[PDB]
Structure formats: C-alpha cells, structure tokens
C-alpha cells in the first residue's frame, strides 16, 4: 500500500514540470489520485483529481489551465503537469489515494520539491565532523541549491541519537546543512561511521567517512 | 467552494494533557470530515475519517466528532509523539478543501545542552574555507544564547544557527551554530571558542580548541 513520487527538481520561469506518482504493485484498482500542494510554510492545497481507468480528470478553478492530470495503468502511474511555473510554485507536491465511499486521502506519496529558480543545480560537498561519557560526530553537508538534501547512517543502520538540522540560507545563496549524531565513546576506536548524503536535483551521491581528530 | 476554519491555529500543552482542535465549514459537510497529522518534513497520515472514524493503526487517545458545519478533534493525554500540525478536510464535495492548520507543540521542563565543538575538516581547508561548528544537544526551551569568541574577541554577523524540531521521544531542540570564515580569516587567530547560555545551566559552559593543536 505505497506510493513512490519523482525526484525533486528546479525549473526555470515560464517552464513545465511533471511529477509522477508510482502505485506501488498495480493498486490503482478501485483507488482515485489526487494531487495536493503545499507552498513551504503553507497549508495543503488541493489541485485536481483523477479516477485513473475512465481518465476523468477534476481540476480546482485555481489551476484550470495550468495543470493536467493523468493517468496510465500499464505502468500504474499518475502524472501531474504544471506550465508556465512562476516563483508561486515552489512548493512540495503530493500524490494521495483517494478512497470513494468516505472521500479520504489514507495514503500520500513521500513529496516532491519542485523549486522555481533561474539558478541552475549545484551538488553539495560533504565534510566530516570529527569527534573530541558520550561523543558525537557528524557531517556537513555544504553549498548546494535547491533543497533537498537526504542523509542517513550507515545505509540506514543508525537512527538513534540522529538529529539532521534544517538547512540554512547563506549570504552565499546557497543552502548548508549538518547532521550529526551521539555515541559513547567506547565505540569509537571500533565502530566505523558513514554518512550518506543524497541530492536527488543534481543526482549527486557522496558517503563520507568520519574519523576521530 | 466550502471553507475551512480551524481554532486555534497553534497551541502548547504538557504531556497528558487533554487537547482539542475545532473545524469549521462555510456550509453543511454532513460527516464528510477528515483529519490528517503532518510531523514535519514528513507526509501527512489519515488519523481520522468520517468525522469519527479511526483509521487502523492510530492510538484510541485520538477521537473525532460532530457533523454538519461543527467538527472537533481531541487527543485525551498529549504525548511527545503527538508534535505536528494537524489538518482538517472535507470531501463532502469538490474542490476537496482543507482547514489552515493547527501545530500543535509539547511543554516540557528545562533541560540543559550538552555543548560539543568542531573545528574545521582538513579537506575542508584545502578549499580555502572554514566551517567551526558549535552543538547544543537535547535541551528545553529553545531559547539560548550563542556566543563566538575568537581569541577572546566576541563575534558578530558571520555564524548562523539551526534548530530541530521537537524531538518525537522527549520534547527537546538540537541547535548548530556555524561560523564561517574564509582560511586566510581563520589562520590569524588560535582560540576558537564557543560560551553558551541557556537556563538549563547553573552558569555558561564553553566549549573551545586552539587552531593547530593535536
């Protein structure tokens, strides 16, 4: 009961994008999509729907125009298209399944970020935050545009003590970030750290080793 | 178009706490009324459909009510899990239209940092950039002061901070501080230190290393 969304991406002004929505093992049977926006800060706002086998597709008079929304059950995948992208537009695009009796959205996509900019990628560089009864240690992930960036622990493994900071703006016009995590110190001298950073816009994919001072 | 108005639109509460969130259509809805919970930078999950309906999974503290235009979401003990905004949505009729929102966040007791310092990587270096990083670690609130002193020299307009968010096991914040400067900048100073305020503390704690030694 999954649904996977497309890679986030920048677009220039007045160009198109078009974000996917993969139901995961065929189940657009008997299940509407819908496409849900939120501007970042905002709330939800809802965009159109699709009941995917007849085609039929329900857009929000705000959007009349601008977005289509599709639908191909060979691949059982949906599709929103939106033109003419204005700075408005940056937002992260979610796909729902939408259930017909009650009219409930019980399952969402992870999100797509879509970022207006006349600015083109830039992938970060990843460097190590080296540890000095608990010591933590850490990556940071610097210099990079759009957002967003991925990180996890050794492929997943670590999860406890993690705290991944939200990325700041610099002067620079570009964004950082750091995560960074606690262990004893014990473990140290023995247990070997990764971190894995992921920038999905510029298909950048860096695993950093980080190593005592 | 039917409107959605959600009251209030933020609130604080200590864990146990009984919290009710009020949803408001512009016109008859019946028991077309759904409630999401977004934590942040996730997506948002179904917690509750035909205005009263449990979807499977969520835990029975959550609860829904009413029908026609007067709708009420109530958790009846808060827990620090519970940090998110929540949404509600009617589908009674299209365009499916939702409320503005209501962030719901946990009042817990003080607790202090646990102050860590980085100073910059090597490979960083070579790029002709430093990055010192200061961490303030699992503390409540999220007020603190975060003081760089370069050879006892105190800075001004060239680190940035960054908090977490509530953490989902016990309420607290996590804040980097990050000053940046360029190598030639860096070079011309030995103390990098970093003094910390914050009312968890009996006093200010800081954190500091000499450039260059092992």
């Known amino acids: 009961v999954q649904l996977v969304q497309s890679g986030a991406e920048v677009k220039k002004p007045g160009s198109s994008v078009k974000v996917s929505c993969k139901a995961s093992?065929?189940?657009?049977?008997?299940?509407?999509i819908s496409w849900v926006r939120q501007a970042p800060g905002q709330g939800l706002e809802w965009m159109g729907g699709?009941?995917?086998?007849?085609?039929?597709?329900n857009y929000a008079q705000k959007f009349q125009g601008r977005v289509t929304i599709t639908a191909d059950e060979s691949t059982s995948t949906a599709y929103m298209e939106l033109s003419s992208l204005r700075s408005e537009d940056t937002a992260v695009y979610y796909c729902?399944?939408?259930?017909?009796?009650?009219?409930?959205?019980?399952?969402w996509g992870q999100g797509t970020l879509v970022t207006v900019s006349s600015a083109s990628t830039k992938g970060p560089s990843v460097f190590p935050l080296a540890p000095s009864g608990t010591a933590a240690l850490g990556c940071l992930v610097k210099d990079y545009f759009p957002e967003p960036v991925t990180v996890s622990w050794n492929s997943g493994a670590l999860t406890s003590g993690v705290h991944t900071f939200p990325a700041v703006l610099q002067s620079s016009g570009l964004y950082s970030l750091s995560s960074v995590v606690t262990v004893p110190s014990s473990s140290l001298g023995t247990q070997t750290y990764i971190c894995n950073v992921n920038h999905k816009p510029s298909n950048t994919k860096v695993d950093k080793k980080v190593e005592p001072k | 178009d039917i409107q959605m108005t959600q009251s209030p639109s933020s609130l604080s509460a200590s864990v146990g706490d009984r919290v009710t969130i009020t949803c408001r259509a512009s016109?008859?809805?019946?028991?077309?009324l759904n409630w999401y919970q977004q934590k942040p930078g996730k997506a948002p999950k179904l917690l509750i459909y035909?205005?009263?309906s449990l979807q499977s999974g969520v835990p029975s503290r959550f609860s829904g009510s009413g029908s026609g235009t007067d709708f009420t979401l109530t958790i009846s003990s808060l827990q620090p899990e519970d940090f998110a905004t929540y949404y509600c949505?009617?589908?009674?009729?299209?365009?499916?239209?939702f409320g503005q929102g209501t962030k719901v966040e946990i009042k817990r007791t003080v607790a202090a940092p646990s102050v860590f310092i980085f100073p910059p990587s090597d490979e960083q270096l070579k790029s002709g950039t430093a990055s010192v990083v200061c961490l303030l670690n699992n503390f409540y609130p999220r007020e603190a002061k975060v003081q760089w002193k370069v050879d006892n020299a105190l800075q001004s307009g060239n680190s940035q901070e960054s908090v977490t968010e509530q953490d989902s096991k016990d309420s607290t914040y996590s804040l980097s501080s990050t000053l940046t400067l360029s190598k030639a900048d860096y070079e011309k100073h030995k103390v990098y230190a970093c003094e910390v305020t914050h009312q968890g503390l009996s006093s200010p704690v800081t954190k500091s290393f000499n450039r260059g030694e092992c």
């Open positions: 729902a399944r939408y259930d017909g009796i009650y009219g409930e959205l019980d399952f």
């Open positions: 093992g065929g189940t657009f049977s008997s299940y509407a």
């Open positions: 699709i009941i995917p086998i007849f085609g039929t597709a």
């Open positions: 016109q008859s809805i019946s028991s077309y």
């Open positions: 035909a205005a009263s």
């Open positions: 949505q009617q589908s009674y009729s299209t365009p499916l239209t």
